[PDB]
Amino acid sequence: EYVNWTTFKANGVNLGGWLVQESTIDSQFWGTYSGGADDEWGLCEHLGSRCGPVLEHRYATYITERDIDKLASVGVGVLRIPTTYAAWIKLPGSQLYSGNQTAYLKQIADYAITKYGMHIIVDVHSLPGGTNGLTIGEASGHWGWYYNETAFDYSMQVIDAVISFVQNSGSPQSYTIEPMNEPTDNPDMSVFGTPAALSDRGATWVLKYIRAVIDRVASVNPNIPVMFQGSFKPEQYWSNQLPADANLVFDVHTYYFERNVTSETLPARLYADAQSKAGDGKFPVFTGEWAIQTLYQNSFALRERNVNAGLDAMYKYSQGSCYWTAKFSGNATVNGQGTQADYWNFEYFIDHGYIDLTRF
Ligand SMILES: *[C@@H]1O[C@H](CO)[C@@H](O)[C@H](O)[C@H]1NC(C)=O
Ligand SMILES: *[C@@H]1O[C@H](CO)[C@@H](O)[C@H](O)[C@H]1NC(C)=O
Ligand SMILES: *[C@@H]1O[C@H](CO)[C@@H](O)[C@H](O)[C@H]1NC(C)=O
Ligand SMILES: *[C@@H]1O[C@H](CO)[C@@H](O)[C@H](O)[C@H]1NC(C)=O
Ligand SMILES: *[C@@H]1O[C@H](CO)[C@@H](O)[C@H](O)[C@H]1NC(C)=O
């Protein structure tokens, strides 16, 4: 059956650091191969002709079917899989690597679908020209996507390629298409993650894009849902700019590592945030990214209580959540106990008995 996000709910993880590279998720990989760069773009340019071979090895090893087995053993029902635009098109001028990403995407997705019945969110994290000035949007310092007709044309070709992948998957009812991630045009980094990170001028271009995508997907298969990561606005900001019959679910992201909160007081914040992001009911809401690290006083002991309290909150007020991220080994210190790898690594929660998603 095709998924209807006004009734469907699921709990799962992101597969971060696998087909999109980021410095924080694997400290050992980034130290060895980045050459000092802070984005995937610069890591790849630094490696030159060796970029492909290195990344192809990572695609084959960082996430495998054994990792999927471990996720299923606790009842994970949804995988959010970030990809770069370079997995889908070969953009002239780009320093991101265009290789066999979709071959690994299919092997892993087919397995999670066939063996365990999981749903797959295919996330196009970056778009040609850059959507947010950050590595995840294309490259550090790139905001060239906005108002750029050439970049717009290439972006729709990206979506055409995702549509075909879903249509020829053998199970198109298993996929949700997410055509962008965290678009922002505000250069002040202290306002990232907040509504002011996207101007109204930039929002008109985002709306142009998301309506073009809604129409293009529906023209091929009106049953494939579209997931709109509407930057850091509330769903109510977008809901009256879109026809009610769009097959549309909103993806909101909720983090706490730069907010004045402690591990002790985190559950109150998790419940408040899920309540305020529940939306107006014209379209449903999914919490596609979250994590339990707080800015202050991080506590090993409270990890089990806090991750389970987040799962509770996002399932009660919304359609569920995907943790960031499945596997994480970055060793940056945090305030209080430990490093980020003690709080962003979903595998540790599974391995130490914190997770039983069948209780929902
Ligand atoms: C999803 O369910 C809602 C509520 O019944 C309905 O209005 C909507 O048309 C359904 N989606 C599709 C694609 O039929
Ligand atoms: C973090 O991990 C990297 C990779 O193993 C290592 O080179 C570095 O020394 C570590 N940093 C700290 C502060 O432990
Ligand atoms: C990518 O996949 C194709 C199709 O199997 C294969 O022929 C090619 O050698 C692969 N390239 C790399 C770099 O693995
Ligand atoms: C427009 O987008 C293209 C495609 O990525 C990019 O190469 C170019 O630099 C962009 N132009 C501007 C002015 O940002
Ligand atoms: C964070 O909050 C605590 C109490 O909630 C307050 O004492 C502290 O000053 C705040 N931090 C900053 C930087 O204002």
DSSP 136: G
Q: Which residues contact 239 (CB under 8 A, 6 or more apart)?
A: 279, 280, 282, 283
- Looking at the chain, which runs of residues are DSSP E strands? 10-14, 78-83, 119-124, 175-178, 226-228, 248-256, 285-294, 320-323
CB 18 within 8 A of CB 83: no
- 60's tokens: 């084959």
Ligand 4 is surrounded, with C-beta below 6 A, by: 91, 93, 128-129, 144, 148, 150-151, 154
What sign has the CA pseudo-torsion 300, 302, 305, 311? Answer: negative
* Domain assignments of the chain as residue spans, ordered by start: 1-360
Residue 43: strand, helix, or coil: helix
Cα of 214 from ligand 4 centre, angstroms:
24
Short-list 39, 127, 18, 128, CA closest to 81 = 18
Residue 98: CB within 6 Å of ligand 3? no
CA distances from 314 to 274, 288, 318 (A): 6, 10, 5
Residue 27: CB within 6 Å of ligand 2? yes
Residue 56: CB within 6 Å of ligand 3? yes
